[PDB]
Amino acid sequence: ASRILLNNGAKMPILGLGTWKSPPGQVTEAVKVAIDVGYRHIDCAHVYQNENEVGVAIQEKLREQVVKREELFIVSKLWCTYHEKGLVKGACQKTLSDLKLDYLDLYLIHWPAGFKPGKEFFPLDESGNVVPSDTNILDTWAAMEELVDEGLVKAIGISNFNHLQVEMILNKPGLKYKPAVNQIECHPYLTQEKLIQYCQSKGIVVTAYSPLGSPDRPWAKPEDPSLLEDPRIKAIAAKHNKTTAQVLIRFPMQRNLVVIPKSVTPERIAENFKVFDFELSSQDMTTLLSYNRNWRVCALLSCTSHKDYPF
Numbered sequence: 001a002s003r004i005l006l007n008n009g010a011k012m013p014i015l016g017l018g019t020w021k022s023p024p025g026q027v028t029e030a031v032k033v034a035i036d037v038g039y040r041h042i043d044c045a046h047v048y049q050n051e052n053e054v055g056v057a058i059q060e061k062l063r064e065q066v067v068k069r070e071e072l073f074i075v076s077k078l079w080c081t082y083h084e085k086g087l088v089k090g091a092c093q094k095t096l097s098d099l100k101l102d103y104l105d106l107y108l109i110h111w112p113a114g115f116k117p118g119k120e121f122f123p124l125d126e127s128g129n130v131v132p133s134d135t136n137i138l139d140t141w142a143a144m145e146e147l148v149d150e151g152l153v154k155a156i157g158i159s160n161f162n163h164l165q166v167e168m169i170l171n172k173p174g175l176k177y178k179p180a181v182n183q184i185e186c187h188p189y190l191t192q193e194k195l196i197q198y199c200q201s202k203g204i205v206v207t208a209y210s211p212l213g214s215p216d217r218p219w220a221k222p223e224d225p226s227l228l229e230d231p232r233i234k235a236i237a238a239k240h241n242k243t244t245a246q247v248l249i250r251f252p253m254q255r256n257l258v259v260i261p262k263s264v265t266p267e268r269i270a271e272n273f274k275v276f277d278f279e280l281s282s283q284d285m286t287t288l289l290s291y292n293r294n295w296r297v298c299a300l301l302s303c304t305s306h307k308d309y310p311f
């Protein structure tokens with residue numbers, strides 16, 4: 001099954017295309033190719049600074065009638081400097097404008113922390129620490145709920161929220177819409193069994209980001225572990241006559257997760273979609289789970305002292 005049912009009643013494609021780091025001069029073609037080869041879910045964010053170019057691609061494929069808008073599942077995210085009551089709607093609207101859409105299928109709080117509003121995405125003090133906002137997560141959630149009620153988004157969710165933070169939202173006094181999704185880092189070196197079982201037990205769908213270990217993350221280092229080169233994963237791939245990436249994409253799908261591998265390489269975009277015609281065994285799945293090292297590629301020192309930093 002290609003889509004998972006969310007607690008808002010809508011169906012979400014379990015495979016999407018990621019767009020963080022996709023250069024603005026490559027990402028329009030990447031998304032055009034993705035839609036042509038079958039993708040129906042695109043993962044976006046204002047902070048990635050490429051939503052206009054993503055939107056050019058989406059718009060051309062809608063115009064050309066390659067796909068219907070109701071067949072697409074477009075996700076974006078509220079950046080940390082817009083957590084304030086009076087800034088959430090305009091942030092969402094900017095994203096809609098850039099993506100050329102009149103609604104999003106899903107809008108996430110990108111990180112639990114709010115930052116001082118302004119032009120800078122990471123406002124710092126003179127000593128290098130991010131400057132917080134005093135807006136708490138529950139007030140930002142209420143602002144997200146209004147976007148549903150105004151028809152700008154069909155579902156709302158969270159991203160990078162830890163157990164305590166998800167629970168805080170679920171226990172919100174007067175909660176109107178539960179989060180549909182929690183999007184978190186997840187791959188064989190960071191398997192997230194505790195947080196995933198918690199979210200799944202509450203009917204929250206988990207999306208796995210960086211499923212290939214984000215080898216293009218700006219802060220990579222030569223010595224770091226490499227999923228795509230791990231000979232044990234290669235061996236599982238070889239047994240199935242698939243690539244390592246295909247194994248790494250199929251793995252979260254069989255955990256009832258959504259997965260959002262990024263590529264701007266047309267051959268790889270196509271290859272990465274070819275994951276609905278094989279099955280990893282239970283043994284394969286447990287073996288991949290056994291590679292957990294609690295190795296997190298998405299973390300940031302400048303934000304570690306923020307009250308709401310999740311890790």
Ligand SMILES: NC(=O)c1ccc[n+]([C@@H]2O[C@H](COP(=O)([O-])OP(=O)(O)OC[C@H]3O[C@@H](n4cnc5c(N)ncnc54)[C@H](OP(=O)(O)O)[C@@H]3O)[C@@H](O)[C@H]2O)c1
Binds near residue numbers: 246
């Ligand atoms: N919510 C959050 O806080 C958050 C944080 C991080 C990521 N995300 C979302 O998750 C998406 C995926 O994560 P990610 O971008 O960090 O990394 P990723 O998907 O784990 O890895 C992307 C890297 O893998 C390469 N790649 C893709 N397919 C490949 C294949 N078949 N063979 C070999 N290499 C392949 C890509 O290269 P090329 O592009 O050069 O082909 C790129 O360098 C992001 O783009 C973003 O949409 C969300």
Ligand SMILES: O=C(O)COc1cc(F)ccc1C(=S)NCc1ccc(Br)cc1F
Binds near residue numbers: 045048111113299
């Ligand atoms: O964030 C992404 O989607 C992928 O990553 C990024 C993508 C961007 F376009 C800009 C910064 C980031 C980083 S540095 N994210 C880490 C990060 C940000 C905020 C807080 Br609170 C903690 C934290 F760990």
Ligand SMILES: [Br-]
Binds near residue numbers: 308
């Ligand atoms: Br944070």
